[PDB]
C-alpha cells in the first residue's frame, strides 16, 4: 500500500490511541465480497486485510454503488477505505467489468473523487499492483455517502476517532 | 508600547485536517510558551531590580 | 467537473467550487471553457492593507 499524505493519516490515527473497530451492516448488494490475495498469508492460506473489504465483480458484472451510513450519536466516525491501482488492463478486466471506474465518497461538508490509473509499477513481493488508502471523518448529524463504479476497497465499519493524549514514536 | 498585529494565522479549529494544521497548532503553542516564559522572567527580573533599587536607595 | 450524487442539503444535491485568479499589471487573463463555467461579472480590487477577519458573537 501507498498512502497519499501518509504523514497526516499517521498523525491523525496516532492522536486518538483507540482501535475500537465496530462492524456495521453495510448495503453491498449485487457484488461479491472477501477478495483473496496470495501475497497475504494467514493460517497458511491466501487471505487479505481484515479491516478492509476488497470487492470484486459478481457474475461478470459490477453494478454502480450508492450506499449511506448516518451518524446519529454524539461522536465522530472515521472510515478507512481505499482504491486499487491494478497492474495492467487485463488485471483490471479480470477483476471488474469497468476499465476506468470513478469513485466518489461524499459527506455533506465535502466530497472526494478519485480516478484509479493503470500502470506497470515495479514488482515488490512478486505483485505489481498497488492500493491507495484514504480516510473520511463524519461529524455528528452528517451522513456518509459512497458511490463507486469500480476499484473500490470498502470499510467493514468505523473507527472511534476521539481526542486523547496518545502519541507515536519510532525506536528500537 | 504595543506593536501592530493586524493579520495572523487562524488559531482555532473545528476539524481534523492533517499535518499543516498540526504544524500551525505546534507553532502557536511554541510561541505562546516562549512568550509566557519571557513574561515570567521579565516580571521576576523587574521585581528583583525594583526591590533592590528601593533598598539601595 | 465530476458528476456525483452528493447528499441533499436544502433540497439540492449539486455543488459549486469557487476558485480565484489574480492578474498582475501587464499580464492578461484568458478563459477557455467547454461547460460547467460560472464566470465573473468583473474584478475585485485586491490590494495590500491592514484589514483582518475574526469570528465572535
Ligand atoms: C515493464 O518493465 C518492467 C521493468 O523492467 C518489467 O517488470 C519486470 O518484469 C520481469 C519480467 O516479467 C520480472 O522478472 C520476472 O518476473 C516473473 C514474475 O512472474 C518471474 O518470471 C520471475 O520471478 C522474475 O521476477 C520483474 O520482476 C519485473 N520487475 C522488475 C522490478 O524488474 C515489466 O514486465 C515490463 N512490462 C510490462 C508489460 O509491465
Ligand atoms: C443515492 O443515495 C442517496 C442517499 O440515500 C439518495 O439521496 C436521498 O434521496 C432521497 C430520495 O430521493 C431523498 O429524500 C426525499 O427526496 C425528495 C427530494 O425531491 C423528496 O421526496 C423528499 O423531500 C425527501 O427529501 C433524500 O433527501 C436524499 N438525500 C439524503 C441525504 O438522504 C439518492 O437519491 C440516491 N440515488 C441517487 C440516484 O442519487
Ligand atoms: C453512482 O454514480 C455513478 C457515476 O459516478 C452513476 O453511474 C451512472 O449510472 C447510470 C444509470 O445506470 C448509467 O447510465 C451511467 O452510465 C453511469 N455513469 C457512470 C459514469 O458510471 C450511478 O448512477 C450512481 N449510482 C446510483 C446507484 O445511482
Ligand atoms: C440493500 O441493497 C439493496 C440493493 O438492491 C436494496 O434493495 C435494499 O433495500 C438494501 N437494504 C436491505 C435491508 O436489503
Ligand atoms: C466475508 O467475510 C466476513 C469475515 O469472515 C464474513 O463476516 C462475511 O459474511 C463474508 N461475506 C461474504 C459475502 O462471504
Ligand atoms: C449471470 O447472468 C446471466 C446473464 O443474465 C444469467 O443467465 C445467469 O443466470 C446469471 N448467474 C447468476 C448466478 O446470477
DSSP for A111-158 reads EEEE------PPPBTTB--EEEEEEEEE-TT-EEEEEESS-EEEESEE
Q: Looking at ligand 2, which residue's alpha carbon is closest to its atom 28?
A: C8
Look at residue A110 and give its three-state secondary structure. Answer: coil
Q: For residue B37, list its beta bridge partners.
A: none
Structural Rg of chain A based on CA atoms: 17
Rounded Cα–Cα distance for residues A79 and B44 (Å):
51
Rounded Cα–Cα distance for residues C45 and C47 (Å):
6
Q: How far is the CA of A58 from the centre of ligand 6 (A)?
A: 10
Q: Which one of A25, A30, A33 would you pick to mutate in the ligand 5 pocket, going by the greatest count of ligand atoms within 8 A of its CB?
A: A33
State the burial class of residue A86 (Cβ atoms within 10 Å of its Cβ: 0-12, 13-18, 19+): buried
Nearest atom, ligand 3, residue A104 CA = 5
Look at residue A7 and give its three-state secondary structure. Answer: helix
Residues near A170 by Cβ (< 8 Å), separated by ≥ 6? none
Q: For residue A36, list its beta bridge partners.
A: none
List the resolution, Å: 3.2
DSSP 8-state class, residue A165: S
Query: Residue A81 belongs to what H/E stretch?
Result: strand A77-85
Closest CA to A106 of A133, A142, A77: A142
Nearest Cα of chain B lies from the Cα of A8 at a distance, in angstroms, of: 5
Per residue, what are the HEC states of chain C? CCCCCCCCECCECCCCCCCCCCCCCCCCCCCCCCCCCCCCCCCCCCCCCCCCCCCCC
Q: For residue C12, list its beta bridge partners.
A: C9
Rounded Cα–Cα distance for residues A4 and A22 (Å):
25
* B19 at A interface, C-beta within 8 A: yes
Rounded Cα–Cα distance for residues A105 and A146 (Å):
5
CB A68 within 8 A of CB A143: yes
Q: How far is the CA of A145 from the centre of ligand 3 (A)?
A: 14
Closest CA to A36 of A86, A95, A109, A124: A95
- Verify whether ligand 2 is closer than 6 Å to residue A64 (CB atom): no
Rounded Cα–Cα distance for residues A32 and A53 (Å):
10
Rounded Cα–Cα distance for residues A3 and A169 (Å):
19
User: Touching A: which chains, 3+ CB pairs < 8 A?
Assistant: B, C
Residue B55 backbone dihedrals phi, psi, to 5 degrees: -110, -35
Query: Residue A103 belongs to what H/E stretch?
Result: strand A103-106
Mutate to test the interface with C, among B3, B4, B5, B6 (most CBs of C within 10 A): B6
Nearest atom, ligand 2, residue C11 CA = 18
Long-range contacts at A19-22 (CB < 8 A, ≥ 24 apart): A19/A159, A20/A159, A20/A160, A21/A51, A21/A156, A21/A157, A21/A158, A21/A159, A22/A157, A22/A158, A22/A160
Three cell numbers, residue A49? 486485510
Question: Closest-CA residue in chain B for C55?
Answer: B12
Rounded Cα–Cα distance for residues A80 and A57 (Å):
21
Look at residue A27 and give its three-state secondary structure. Answer: coil
DSSP 8-state class, residue B10: -
Partner-chain contact B18 A5, CB within 8 Å = yes
Is residue B56 left, alpha or beta, with left meaning phi > 0 and alpha meaning psi from -120 to 50?
A: alpha
State the burial class of residue A9 (Cβ atoms within 10 Å of its Cβ: 0-12, 13-18, 19+): middle
- Verify whether ligand 1 is closer than 6 Å to residue A43 (CB atom): no
DSSP 8-state class, residue A64: P
Amino acid at each position: 500500500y501507498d498512502v497519499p499524505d501518509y504523514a497526516s493519516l499517521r498523525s491523525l490515527v496516532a492522536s486518538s490511541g483507540t482501535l475500537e473497530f465496530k462492524n456495521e451492516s453495510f448495503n453491498w448488494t449485487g457484488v461479491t465480497q472477501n477478495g483473496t490475495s496470495s501475497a497475504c498469508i494467514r493460517g497458511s492460506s491466501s487471505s487479505f486485510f481484515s479491516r478492509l473489504n476488497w470487492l470484486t465483480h459478481l457474475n461478470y458484472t459490477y453494478p454502480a454503488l450508492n450506499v449511506t451510513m448516518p451518524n446519529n450519536e454524539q461522536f465522530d466516525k472515521l472510515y478507512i477505505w481505499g482504491v486499487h491501482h491494478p497492474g495492467t488492463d487485463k488485471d483490471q478486466i479480470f477483476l471488474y467489468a469497468q476499465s476506468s471506474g470513478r469513485i466518489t465518497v461524499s459527506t455533506k461538508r465535502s466530497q472526494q473523487a478519485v480516478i484509479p490509473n493503470i500502470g506497470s509499477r515495479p514488482r515488490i513481493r512478486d505483485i505489481p499492483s498497488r492500493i491507495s488508502i484514504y480516510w473520511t471523518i463524519v461529524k455528528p448529524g452528517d451522513i456518509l455517502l459512497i458511490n463507486s463504479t469500480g476499484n473500490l476497497i470498502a470499510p467493514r465499519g468505523y473507527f472511534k476517532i476521539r481526542s486523547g493524549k496518545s502519541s507515536i514514536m519510532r525506536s528500537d | 508600547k504595543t506593536n501592530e498585529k493586524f493579520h495572523q494565522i487562524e488559531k482555532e479549529f473545528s476539524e481534523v485536517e492533517g499535518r499543516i494544521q498540526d504544524l500551525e497548532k505546534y507553532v502557536e503553542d511554541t510561541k505562546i510558551d516562549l512568550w509566557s516564559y519571557n513574561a515570567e522572567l521579565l516580571v521576576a527580573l523587574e521585581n528583583q531590580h525594583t526591590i533592590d533599587l528601593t533598598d539601595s536607595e
